Amino acid sequence: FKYESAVQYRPAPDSYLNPCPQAGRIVKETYTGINGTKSLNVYLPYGYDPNKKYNIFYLMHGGGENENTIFSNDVKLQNILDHAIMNGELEPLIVVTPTFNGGNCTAQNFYQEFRQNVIPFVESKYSTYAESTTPQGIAASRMHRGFGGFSMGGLTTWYVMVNCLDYVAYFMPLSGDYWYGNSPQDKANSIAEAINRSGLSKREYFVFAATGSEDIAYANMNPQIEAMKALPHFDYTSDFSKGNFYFLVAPGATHWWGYVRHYIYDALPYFFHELEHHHHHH
């Protein structure tokens, strides 16, 4: 892997959509938190070794979907992850698919359950960079923790960002805008105030947004992206060795996981290299 400054949309080869012999294990989990008893899936990379430490990426489904959608026949994201890790395009990581369904949970308020229940449950059981899952242990491993999502799950992602910068450094909002404001500048300012309160430097948080040029999400995302670009908090470029903000728009892509899985193929290899604990040249 090498960073590009303006990475372009490129679908995974069609071969990546079929099962790979080097298949990561997908574990169905059940936990109880502030929204009652709920499930999530945990993708473990092929060769997962609990004596090693893995990057972790939490990835939210869209409206009318559930914690099983992303690894279902409708999406098959695990095949793409399996092929990309096997081919060395993507460093091995843990991918979690939770749900905003259940109890008092909504796409907007999921971050509260994420903080209190989901991180402690997943990262007590599986080997992340978290030494412990106290607030301190989670915060001290933030550079190795990412959140993303599609549509309503992209809205989850923006609310995770504004409320969880202490816990998460890498954000992948796909086809979803941040509902918090009466203008694009209010949206940008809300994110800027979150960043100000966090104390973090511009080198300590990263946003790879994406959508399709034929995805309705573009209408509200693009103005938000333009307003954020104007902030001093963001240096626009996909080269995260130099800046921290990018917006990939896939030509012709519609509001459909068939396209959105390719955004994760394009974007997820960009994550978790800044202050990484390996000696890599990107």
Residue numbers in the entry: 16 to 297
The authors write:
ID30A-3 (or MASSIF-3) is a mini-focus (beam size 18 µm × 14 µm) highly intense (2.0 × 1013 photons s−1), fixed-energy (12.81 keV) beamline for macromolecular crystallography (MX) experiments at the European Synchrotron Radiation Facility (ESRF). MASSIF-3 is recommended for collecting diffraction data from single small crystals (≤15 µm in one dimension) or for experiments using serial methods.
In a first experiment, we collected diffraction data from a Se-Met derivatized crystal of ferulic acid esterase with the aim of de novo structure determination using the SAD technique (f′′ = 3.7 e− at 12.834 keV). The transmitted white beam then impinges on a liquid-nitro­gen-cooled single Si(111) crystal with a bandwidth of 1.5 × 10−4 used as a monochromator for MASSIF-3, which delivers a beam at a photon energy of 12.812 keV into its experimental hutch (EH2). This energy on the high-energy remote side of the selenium edge was chosen in order to be able to use the anomalous scattering contribution from selenium for de novo phasing experiments. Data were measured according to a strategy proposed by an EDNA characterization at 100 K from a crystal cryo-protected using Paratone N and were automatically processed. Subsequent de novo phasing performed with hkl2map and SHELXC/D/E found all 16 Se sites (8 per chain), and automatic building with ARP/WARP resulted in a model containing 280 and 281 residues (out of 297 residues) for the two FAE monomers in the asymmetric unit which was then further refined using Coot and refmac.
